Amino acid sequence: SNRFFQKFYLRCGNCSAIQRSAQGYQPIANPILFKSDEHCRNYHDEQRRAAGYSGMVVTCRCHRCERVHSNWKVLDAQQFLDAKLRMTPEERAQRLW
Amino acid sequence: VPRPPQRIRAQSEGVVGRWYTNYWTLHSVRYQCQLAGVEWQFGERQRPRTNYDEPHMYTDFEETKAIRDYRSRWINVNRSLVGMSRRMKESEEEARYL
Amino acid sequence: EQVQDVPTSTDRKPTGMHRGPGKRQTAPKEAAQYQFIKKWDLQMRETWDELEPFKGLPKPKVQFGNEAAEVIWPYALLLENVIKVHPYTKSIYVYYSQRQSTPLGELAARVAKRVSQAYLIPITFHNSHVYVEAEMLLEYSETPWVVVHCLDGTHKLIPVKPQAGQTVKEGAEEVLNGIVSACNEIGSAVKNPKEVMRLLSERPLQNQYVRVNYQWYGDTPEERMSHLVKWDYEPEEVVPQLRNRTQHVLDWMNYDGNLPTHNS
Amino acid sequence: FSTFALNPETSRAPHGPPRGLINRYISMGLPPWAAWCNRVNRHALYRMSDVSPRSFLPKAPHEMDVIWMNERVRERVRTSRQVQHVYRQLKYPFVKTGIHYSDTLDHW
Amino acid sequence: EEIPKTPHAYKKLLEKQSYTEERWKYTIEYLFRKYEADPPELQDK
Amino acid sequence: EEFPTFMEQELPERKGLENFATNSRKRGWLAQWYEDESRYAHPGAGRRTAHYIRPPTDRDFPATIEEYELAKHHQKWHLNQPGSATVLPWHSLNTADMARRSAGRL
Amino acid sequence: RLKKRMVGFIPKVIPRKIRNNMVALRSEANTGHMEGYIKTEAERLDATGRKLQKTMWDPVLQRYTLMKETKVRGPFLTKSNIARKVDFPVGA
Amino acid sequence: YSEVKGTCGTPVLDQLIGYYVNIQSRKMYYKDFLRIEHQAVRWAFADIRKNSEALAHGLLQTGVRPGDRVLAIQPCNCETFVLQLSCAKIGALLCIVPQDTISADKLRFYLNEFQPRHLVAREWINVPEMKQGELVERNMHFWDTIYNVIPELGLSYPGQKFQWVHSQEFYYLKKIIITDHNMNLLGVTPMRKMLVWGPFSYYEQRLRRLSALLHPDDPVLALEDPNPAMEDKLHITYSHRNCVNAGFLFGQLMQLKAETRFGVMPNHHTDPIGAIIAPYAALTSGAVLVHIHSDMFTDDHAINGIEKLCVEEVETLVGRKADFDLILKHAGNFDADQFEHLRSVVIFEDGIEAPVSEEYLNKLSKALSLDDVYVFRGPIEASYMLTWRTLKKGSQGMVPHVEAKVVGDRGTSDAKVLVAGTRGNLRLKGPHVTAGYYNNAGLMTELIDEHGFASTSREAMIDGKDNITLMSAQTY
Amino acid sequence: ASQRWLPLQTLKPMGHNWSAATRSSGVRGPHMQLMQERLDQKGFGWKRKSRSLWQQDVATAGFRPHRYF
Amino acid sequence: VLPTKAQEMGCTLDEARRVYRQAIMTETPTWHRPLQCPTVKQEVQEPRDQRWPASPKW
Amino acid sequence: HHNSSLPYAKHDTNNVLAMRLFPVNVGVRARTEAIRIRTDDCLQRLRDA
């Protein structure tokens, strides 16, 4: 349930391929027949993604090594430019997209 | 370079070392280059989209749900109405019996 | 599920010496213990079944090379092997012999049986037009073949030809680039498309039998559709219908002589 | 909040800014318990937007003894049973007897 | 890296960790030990 | 006089586009664009995906089982209507935004 | 407040409240209409083992249709009020 | 894309039916309007004005009130036209059921579906039937159909003709207008005849008063449906605007000027040709409608039906293709010079049947000496006209003032036009195309979005040039 | 002028969703509480679902017997 | 299997035993991963109290 | 008694002449708003004549 959009820049651990994976708009569980557990843990969980995947294992499939794992280090987008701007123009074709 | 969230203050300390990462310094300089006429070489904010995205002026779903749910009920009353005058006929000749 | 006969109690000494409601009866951590333990004891009696969830799915056509269907596939695996074919291909069949005489014949059947297992069923799950089926023939046929059909009713053969030196771990990758090549080539060499644009948009789902162990995707059918949701950042559609300003097209550059100079 | 069965993820609100009352408080960052406020004063939506948490430490920062990593004694406002009285109470964390083996000093 | 605050929120985390760590469970070769040779109904006795 | 250059203007609310912006009865300023460019679906969209910005599948038909059995049940939950294939939610939010003129002139 | 059951003029009997005295004559044409009707003493007493029936203007259809009796509490157009399809004696 | 549209430069009629009868009964009073030989009726526009204003008053006295219905089982008559005029002047929904098949069971249906205040039916109905595999006419005794339906008429007691409800089964039914040509001098006595002559009032013909209140878009017809879009559309309802323009569209393309003796093959008063497209074409744009032999199914009168169009100087004949084999099988007997007064023929094809292949039209002109053959294609919703394709110049422009877009199911007024190769819903638009359809539940309508497009609920696929092909509802 | 033709009115087979005698019926605003929001199918049920809430605000729909309400 | 798999990574056989088993998650009664892959065909939602033409309420 | 629609007595309710001629398909509050837009035109047709 993320009302707002946000795109992370996940860095794999196997190939360090900085791929970006966004988070769309997934609507709130219905309030009409409210359910206190499914809501208040939808919200509290939403701060934990909004703060750069704080307390969650990230599970997205790589683009370089085509496989899905849980090894991603979520890069704040000024730690990403720290990395992107500091790669020779060829390895940007290797690790970035 | 993304938009910092709401909880982060909106402050561009100006053109300084690595100013182009300050999202507000970047998109403000990017705007004076318009009023000045300088040619912005770098790319524009690419608003990302999904497979299942819908356009803005979408095709609404309620006025088609209720225009449909009535056909359902008028396709049913149409069925359940066969021989209704014959049916209600014997409704009386049984009530007139009691 | 055959293991639901959990004894409504447990050995654990009840904490709370005094007395009260809720004592000495099973706990949802203990109810999962006995469920697992008495699941293993069936799994030794072999009576334990895994088609307990997949009860609505039409049970696939059993066949001796078609064991690829009865396997419960991990949804995080059918996400990795994302193979796509030209949409106008209605089916794929991969036949191969049982026992292969020549040493290079056993090489190919290894590739076929591999591609019969590795790459065929993801194509079904991902493309859902194709009716992927594999059958093991029984004779010393030292060469397997693949019958790539198409929507127009046409079809081709793909003689499974792996190189002697290569492994089978790439012999299929070759065959893959030997099928997905044909599928587009067949779909490009089709006749008039108006008909197949109807059958394709009429062809029911062929991949219904496929048994996908949705692992950590069990939250809501939203994430069960996670392989169809396809993020597309930097999307590009640069073809605007520009509407120019015909009336008073000039007159923006001809007004407000700012603060008229010495002459006026 | 939308009513369809299968709502595949998407970039933006597919059907306009999310309707409903609880979507009104999520559209502004608040948590879904704002739906149960009787007064939502400018301090209230400050109080409950968790700008700075109303949550403290049992002893001083200097005299603190038991290792409270990142915790406070957060007060949980409960609403009572059948007749809804609102009362609050201070909920602590659970301190365990940490009986470890730090192999630096080769002893528990 | 993330603690689960609910059993079924853990029994999903066991599914994630069963994939990354013990990956040989999810090979096209381990999903087919049952079938590396003849379907059992055609072998001798 | 506070906007030195044309700072792009967002189209009005969907409710406005229904009634004024695109409705030729008022000669709304989009009554030219709506008929020219908007009211045409994507050149690849079938019948079900006529409203997606681009058809989310390589085939109009339902994609997976739960999108199908849901539509295999819906098309019979509603007596078999022509367009009833497209699954719709069985609950009216009764919102004013999803309200367009149900009866009126033309 | 307490005083949940009033005591001034507790009426002897009371027509509206009696095991099935008020009945929703819902329409047999499954248009969802209903016309609440209190069974008179002609049917208050079990003169009718049969479930009451009447002919009443069905304001939706604007036609006189059957009204089969039914409890007044309940959804009046359930998945039970669907009529099995039939090909009419019209058409080719 | 998946949109076709016809030109707009043609004028669109809009007023009531009863108005275009006036200003034709002034501009052309004595000019013939319809001639028939099977009843010997040479009607001038003067007649239908006088014979409808005196028939609408003939139903007011017999109980028909504006909202009510009225049923017609007339076989291919003339008096089944003045019914439409009368039932338009009082708003009563005239319903024309196909007589070519009837039984007490199909009648126990229309009496329950339409619930008519009046039932206009004959004693003898010429119903076709196949003997030894061959079609032969069987004079059906329709009288026995009624009495089975109404066992009340036999059980006669000295009070029953003044009884309130004549048949407690069908309380809807109040009179049964028998229409059987009769040869006795002294007609039926006023006990059993409706007064249809004279000034029925004193101070104002109370039709033109009630003719003020009903609107050019409310029903006057209910033509039964051969193949229904889906289980609901048991009948199609045409209003005033839908029928009157369905003539002035056709009356435009055939350029039927005054002095035009154009015929219509019989057995079409059921489908829109004989009901709206044929007569109301002869009405708006001054013309002559020469009906042909009472029926046209069996071979024996197809030979006769030609001599009818040999003396009556007919200039074109409209009718479905199933009528044009009977003309074809016996174009050999008559000499070529018997179709010298002919110029063209019109074949109204239903939207679903098949493209009548230009080889077959070549048979027709080779038998009937025709300048051209026109083929009007379209559903019954659109009154059998969306694409008209001539024989010589087969190019088929959409009829003027029509649209047809195929849209996706989701929205209604925003449902986006499809991509011209895919089946979606069909949305028609135009004067002649109707939006309402009768049903067991009563008068009903279909969506008319806020752009004028009326859903027809018949999924179709539009192709390259004006070529709308219908399809059946998908059921996956 | 342009001879274009359009009908007089749009007939939609849609049914009104506000019946004067039905309680929570109506067209609510885009941010009003949708019909029976938080109620969960019970009379004043949004009160009964308050103890179920994880944590409420400090000023949260407390006790208020309708006195001169 | 791992012999042939190690040649696919282009590495040594012993090295792959830490790419195909990064840790040996043995199994207990107390620690089973879900025994039955949850049901794939979920039961179809319905309007509330078997109401049929849609439902006004939740 | 216990009816809801007493026969048309003398009451100036909606255009019952046009309540008969109209599709029952449309709901009520969308019909009484459409028998008027029919009548609103029948008033213009009458004024123009």
Ligand SMILES: [Zn+2]
């Ligand atoms: Zn990677």
